[PDB]
DNA sequence: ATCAATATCCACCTGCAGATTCTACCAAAAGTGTATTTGGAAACTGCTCCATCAAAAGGCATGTTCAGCGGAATTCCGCTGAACATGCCTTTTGATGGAGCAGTTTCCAAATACACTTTTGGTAGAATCTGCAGGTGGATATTGAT
DNA sequence: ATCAATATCCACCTGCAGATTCTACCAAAAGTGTATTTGGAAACTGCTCCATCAAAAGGCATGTTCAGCGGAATTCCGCTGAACATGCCTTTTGATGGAGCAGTTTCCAAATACACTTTTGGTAGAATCTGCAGGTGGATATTGAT
């Protein structure tokens, strides 16, 4: 069992429902996973770059928050 | 003593805001005497505007504490704040809404 | 243990004048603090860009004011400016 | 025996209501934590994570995917369907400027 | 007939000819003076007595045509997604809702 | 010492100009309602940009809107322009 | 006397770049000796990458001077430059393209 | 005063090295001039915050490098970092 | 339209996680008084370029006519997702060493600052050079009738 | 498939606008050389909280079944493209007065740099407090079969 498959149909189905979606094609599950992988790669890459620069080995909430902000995806509620 | 903030009739920290402005400066730049006052009044005002709507959102739910969900309700529900606050509010969810064409049985 | 400044107590005071009998959860306060930090940053940033465009070194209340007109949507700006002129006045006239 | 079945689409509308009412996270936690750590491992090894960091990543991802499902639905409805398909997610990402 | 049927390109043929043509050129496609009046008129309704460096107006025109052209590419994707080849107001609206704009 | 009143200049963005813009954007067929929609969308876009440009102009106490004013206004709204400044 | 640029083996102006960093400083801000050097190298390198590609395009069009149209074909044409340069390039038009379902 | 700084003489030098018999129109040079200013403002900006987040007041070559890794796409970053490194090392080899 | 199976709703209830009221200590703020410093306003004014008016002519907008074919309405059928209930494997939760993240103090390599001398990019201006816009013409497509 | 009608592509060709090549100059830039200052790498360390591990919780994978969705097919009205006639208004070229922008210089209200004193927001450990999430029950609504 590959990690990305830990993001299961049921979880993907719940996200879509909160998104007001009514009926889901079967191919949607793999596509959503690719999309999440790309989103997470873009953000983690920036978080880890802030970590290394600070010479730490622990990615912190702030590193994630500054990474999200850099990408135009500002998040409130975790510092900064 | 009085204090800049009290002297201006504000709750927000004029002294602190001032200090902070001296650090968002052009190498050797200066900060006007009143600039901090003005800034502090602007932050105080917006904070009041959001608490006021978040506060109504919680009273209309017969509850005492403003939560992230209340803040999400107040912000996405007001055209001007919605426009100004693009950040994701952790724990806020979305405004309920189902497209007319999905709601159905039709006839 | 080094001090982390926050706007929490000032947010709480403003809360009290607005809904004297309402509270605010921890997670909600954290959001408000992020909101206040974010808005101050966008404002000081525009104001210093304004100063630089005009070959000036001082960030005066006049830059803070144009920055508010550039950052806030109509009504919000109308009142905010109004709240700003009003604090400066009350402060200019004092001892 | 007991023959009771809801019509296709009735439970689905009930789910939309339930999930738009609530605010909790919807992806199970450990699975998401594992995914995060694996993606990070390709950028740097022996990394640890504050707990609040993994949580911020999960809050950002879910807000992103939920909002992407809203635009995706708009694209399916624009094409007169009620079923979202990969081409709708694609059209939506293409217009957002994310391309992929 | 006598001088028989005067030649006529089928609907769509000249339109494709046009996309090839404008896509390979770079000139401003909106006439200049009328676009300058539109600018002066909108500016005036915000603050009277304003003057304009001529390059300020040229900057707004370049920005505007670059914004419209990119909006018609997105609108064209919404029409085709709907199996049409004709762009409609609903295609433009869909593109702007997804882009996160409004009006 | 004179005049001239500006009115309805949005009709100066003519149907042929809109068709040219759509051709460059790769559009093959255009419905009849696209033209008034495009005008409305251009008016809003210019209003937002001219509004910010004029705000920089006034801030600087000038009466002349400069190419720089337009360029900073385009930048604030995320629509960077190269060729005059940026 | 060797210039800091010459000392670094660069065409881009180190002294000036150092000056500009000191003035975008931030109060008690300091600018290290080598920060301007590294900056001039990134700037000179990006500039080199864009001209290399624009110059190839002005050449496949049997022409000597690079125009905004060449800068635009070069940038939209390269995945990474396209991603890095979102600005509108005045006078560059677009990359020719027609959707298969329109042909 | 009146004299305005430009990067045009430097862009010309670089153009001569990559395309010895190629010229550049003034419109094109204008774009290159904006492009360079834009990239520099973006790098200095990221380097400042970067320093800020770490409670540092000095912007070193180390901040510029991280700024560059955050701003450029994969491959452009590698080559730029290696050219940045090369020029620092050479520069310090004279002092 | 009549049941029957279930979902939904609301009044009420209580335990504990999250909030709060309390005391105290202190590095750092924040305010006052006094002295030096300087940015930028006010004023004079040189000098660019913006509004404007003039005239001439053809590129291009407007308005019409006509019919091709695209959009949208309807019909219909195969198949794909929704619903569901059986079956156990993975997540969640609460408890515990030790890894790093922070706080602290040391002390020099590095960065500021100022004085002298030198090298240079910007710019003003008469000036001789040249790439290419855009017009011309004929060779090769491309298109649409039949 | 031939074939008449246009469109397009392409390489040659040429007057000039936009470019590249000096001449003379000058404030500001940029580097050399001492003097004074200090930010933060470097080492040591205490204790938060991150990884891990056992047990208790509960959501997911699975296979069947068929309702109803998507899309293929077919029809057809009416709207949009193509072509054409007519002529207007944008473009082009030039000169003109002068609004307003921008350079230079003087001088003070406003802003900074200490020194000194006093209040305060943040943090620690604790005691008692409480809003409300989450669970009940019973009334009523909803949904789907007949
Ligand atoms: Mn809806
Ligand atoms: Mn008007
Ligand atoms: Mn295509
Ligand atoms: Mn001065
Ligand atoms: Mn006419
Ligand atoms: Mn059709
Ligand atoms: Mn250790
Ligand atoms: Mn020189
Ligand atoms: Mn040509
Ligand atoms: Mn120190
Ligand atoms: Mn159907
Ligand atoms: Mn005047
Ligand atoms: Mn206190
Ligand atoms: Mn409840
Ligand atoms: Mn019950």
Q: From residue C19, give the alpha-carbon distance in Å to each of B41, B47, B53, B68, C13.
A: 19, 13, 10, 17, 10
Question: Would the CB atoms of D95 and E95 count as touching at under 8 Å?
Answer: yes
Torsion over CA: D91, D92, D93, D99 (sign): positive
- Ligand 9 centroid, distance to E23 Cα (angstroms): 16
D88 has a chain E CB within 8 A of its CB: yes
Residue in A76, A78, A79 closest to C35 by CB: A76
Q: How far is F53 from F47, CA to CA, in rounded Å?
A: 10
What kind and span of H or E run contains G22? helix G14-23
Smallest CA-to-CA distance from C28 within H21, B86, E11, B64 is with: B64
Task: Identify the residue among D63, D74, D84 best suited for mutation to test binding to B, counting B beta carbons within 10 A and taking the highest.
Answer: D63
B26 with G23: Cβ contact below 8 A: yes
Pairing between strand B88-89 and G88-89? unpaired
Q: Which residues pair with E85 in a beta bridge?
A: none
How many other CB atoms sit within 10 Å of the CB of residue D53?
A: 24
Give B1-107's CATH code, choosing from 3.30.420.40, 3.40.50.2000, 1.10.20.10, 3.30.420.10.
1.10.20.10
**Alpha carbons D17 and D19: distance in angstroms, whole number:** 6
* Method used experimentally: X-ray
Q: From ligand 8's centre to the CA of C52, what distance in Å?
A: 28
Q: Which domain holds residue H22?
A: 1-95
E89 touches strand J (CB under 7 A): no
Which distant-in-sequence residues (6+ apart) come within 8 Å of F14 by Cβ? Answer: E31, E34
CA distance F43 to F36: 11
Pairing of strands F29-30, A75-76: unpaired
Q: Is B96 helix (H, G, I), strand (E, B) or coil?
A: coil
Q: Which candidate, E80, D78, D63, places its Cα nearest to that of B99?
A: D78
Q: Map tokens 């620069």 to a residue.
A: A53
Check residue H4 and report its DSSP letter. Answer: P
Nearest CA-CA distance, residue G98 and chain F, Å: 6
In whole angstroms, what is the distance from residue H31 CA to residue G68 CA?
7
Strands E51-52 and F64-65 come out as parallel
Specify the number of domains making up chain C.
1
**Phi, psi values for residue D68, rounded to 5°:** -70, -30
How many C-beta atoms surround the C-beta of residue C8 within 10 A?
A: 15
Contact: D16, A43; criterion CB under 8 Å: no
Residues 60-89 of chain C: which lie with beta carbon within 7 Å of strand J? Answer: 60
| F70 and chain E in contact, CB less than 8 A | yes
Residues of D in contact with E84 (CB under 8 A): none
With touching defined as 3 or more inter-chain CB pairs under 8 Å, the answer for chains B and A is yes
Task: Give the residue nearest to nucleotide I118 (CA to C1').
Answer: G1
User: Mutate which of E23, E77, E83 to test chain G, going by most G C-beta atoms within 10 A?
Assistant: E23
A54 contact H CB<8A = yes
In this structure, are residues C39 and B50 in contact, taking their beta carbons and an 8 Å threshold?
no
- Interatomic CA distance for residues A61 and G70, integer angstroms: 44
CB-hemisphere CA count at 13 Å for A13? Answer: 13
Protein-to-nucleotide distance from the CA of G30 to the C1' of J81, whole angstroms: 66
Instruction: Write out chain G residues lying below 8 Å of F83, CB-based.
Output: 68, 89-91
Which DSSP letter does residue C29 get? H
Name the CATH superfamily, with its identifier, for domain F1-86.
Histone, subunit A (1.10.20.10)
G3: phi then psi, degrees, rounded to nearest 5: -65, 160
In sequence order, the β-bridge partners of residue C59 are B31
List of chain B residues whose C-beta atoms are within 8 Å of the C-beta of residue A18:
93-94
Is C54 (CB) below 7 Å from strand J?
no
The ligand whose atoms approach the alpha carbon of C57 most closely is 4
Distance D63 CA to I80 C1' (A): 29
Domain spans of chain G, in order of start: 1-103
Cβ contacts of residue A67 below 8 Å, gap of 6+? A43, A44, A45, A46, A47, A49, A50
Alpha helices in chain E (DSSP H): 13-23, 32-44, 54-81, 89-99
Chain J: nucleotides under 7 Å from a protein CB?
5-9, 11, 18-20, 27-32, 39-41, 49-51, 59-61, 67-71, 79-84, 89-91, 99-104, 110-112, 118-124, 131-133, 143-145
Of 3.40.50.12160, 1.10.20.10, 3.40.1580.10, 3.30.565.10, the CATH number of G1-103 is: 1.10.20.10
CA B44 / C1′ J49 distance in Å: 36
Q: Do chains G and F touch (3 or more CB pairs under 8 A)?
A: yes
Question: What's the CA gap between D66 and D89, in Å, rounded?
Answer: 12
DSSP letter at A3 equals G
**D89 Cβ contact list (under 8 Å, min separation 6):** A28, A31, A32, A35, D68, D72
From the number of C-beta atoms within 10 Å of its C-beta (0-12, 13-18, 19+), residue D3 rates as exposed
Chains A, D: CB pairs < 8 Å? 173
Count other Cβ atoms within 10 Å, centred on residue B30.
16
β-pair type (A75-76, B88-89): parallel
Do residues B80 and B45 make contact, with C-beta atoms less than 8 angstroms apart?
Answer: no
Q: Does G25 touch chain B (CB under 8 A)?
A: yes
3-state secondary structure of A59: strand
Euclidean distance between CA atoms H16 and H3, whole angstroms: 25
C-beta atoms surrounding D81 within 10 Å:
15
User: Which nucleotides in chain I lie less than 7 Å from some protein C-beta?
Assistant: 5-8, 18-20, 28-32, 39-40, 49-53, 60-62, 68-72, 80-85, 90-92, 99-104, 110-112, 118-124, 131-133, 143-146
Three-class secondary structure of residue E84 per DSSP: coil
Domains and CATH numbers, chain D: 1-100 (1.10.20.10)
Would the CB atoms of A76 and C38 count as touching at under 8 Å? yes
Quick check: D64 and A39 in contact, CB under 8 A?
A: yes
Instruction: Identify whether the C-beta of residue H24 lies closer than 8 Å to the C-beta of residue H6.
Output: no
Q: For residue E92, what are its two tokens?
A: 């433009």
| Nearest ligand for residue E25 CA | 9
CA angle C6, D59, A25 (to 5 degrees): 160
Where do breaks (C to N over 2.5 Å) occur in chain D, by preceding residue number?
none
Asked whether H81 and H65 are in contact (CB, 8 A), the reply is yes
C23 CA to centre of ligand 13 in angstroms = 21
Strand J within 7 A of B106 CB: no
Examine chains C and F and say if they touch (3+ CB pairs below 8 A). yes
The CATH homologous superfamily for domain A1-80 is Histone, subunit A (1.10.20.10)
End-to-end, the C-alpha distance of chain C in Å comes to: 38
Q: Which residues on chain H are in Cβ contact (under 8 Å) with A62?
A: 53
Task: Report the Cα H86 to chain-centroid distance in Å.
Answer: 14
Q: Is G63 exposed, middle or buried (0-12, 13-18, 19+ CB in 10 A)?
A: middle
CA–CA gap between residue H58 and residue H48 (Å, rounded): 9
Nearest to E82, CA basis, from D80, C6, B34, C27: D80
Residue with tokens 């000796």: G33
Task: Quote the crossing angle between the two packed helices H74-92 and G35-59, to the nearest 10°.
Answer: 130
Instruction: Give the DSSP per-residue string, D26-42.
Output: -S-HHHHHHHHHHHHHT
Residues in CB range of A46: below 8 A, 6 or more apart: A66, A67, A70, A71, H70
Using a 7 Å CB cutoff, list residues 53-72 of G near strand J. Answer: 62, 65
Whether residue D78 contacts residue E78, with contact meaning beta carbons closer than 8 Å, is answered with yes
DSSP D7: P
Structure tokens at B106: 């039709």
Q: Is the CB of A10 under 7 A from strand J?
A: yes
């Amino acid at each position: 069992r590959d990690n990305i498959q830990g993001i299961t149909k049921p979880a993907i189905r719940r996200l879509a429902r909160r998104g007001g979606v009514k009926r889901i094609s079967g191919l949607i599950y793999e596509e959503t996973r690719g999309v999440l992988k790309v989103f997470l790669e873009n953000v983690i890459r920036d978080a880890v770059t802030y970590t290394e620069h600070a010479k730490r080995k622990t990615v912190t909430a702030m590193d994630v928050v500054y990474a999200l902000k850099r990408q135009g995806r500002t998040l409130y509620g975790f510092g900064g | 003593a009085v204090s800049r903030s009290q002297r201006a009739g504000l709750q927000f920290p004029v002294g602190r805001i001032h200090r902070h402005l001296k650090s968002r400066t052009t190498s050797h730049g200066r900060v006007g005497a009143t600039a901090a006052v003005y800034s502090a009044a602007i932050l105080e005002y917006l904070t009041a505007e959001v608490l006021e709507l978040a506060g109504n959102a919680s009273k209309d739910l017969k509850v005492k504490r403003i939560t992230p969900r209340h803040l999400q309700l107040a912000i996405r529900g007001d055209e001007e704040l919605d426009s100004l606050i693009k950040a994701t509010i952790a724990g806020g969810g979305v405004i309920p809404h189902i497209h007319k064409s999905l709601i159905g049985k039709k006839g | 243990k080094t001090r982390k400044e926050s706007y929490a107590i000032y947010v709480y005071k403003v809360l009290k004048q607005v809904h004297p009998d309402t509270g605010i959860s921890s997670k909600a306060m954290s959001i408000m603090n992020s909101f206040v930090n974010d808005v101050f940053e966008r404002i000081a940033g525009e104001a210093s860009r304004l100063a630089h465009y005009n070959k000036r070194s001082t960030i005066t209340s006049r830059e803070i004011q144009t920055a508010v007109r550039l950052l806030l949507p109509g009504e919000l700006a109308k009142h905010a400016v109004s709240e700003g002129t009003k604090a400066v006045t009350k402060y200019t006239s004092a001892k | 025996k007991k023959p009771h079945r809801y019509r296709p689409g009735t439970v689905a509308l009930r789910e939309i209501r339930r999930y738009q009412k609530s605010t909790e996270l919807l992806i199970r936690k450990l699975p998401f934590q594992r995914l995060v750590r694996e993606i990070a491992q390709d950028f740097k090894t022996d990394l640890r994570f504050q707990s609040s960091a993994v949580m911020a990543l999960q809050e950002a991802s879910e807000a992103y995917l939920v909002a992407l499902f809203e635009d995706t639905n708009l694209c399916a409805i624009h094409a007169k369907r009620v079923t979202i398909m990969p081409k709708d997610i694609q059209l939506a990402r293409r217009i957002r400027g994310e391309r992929a």
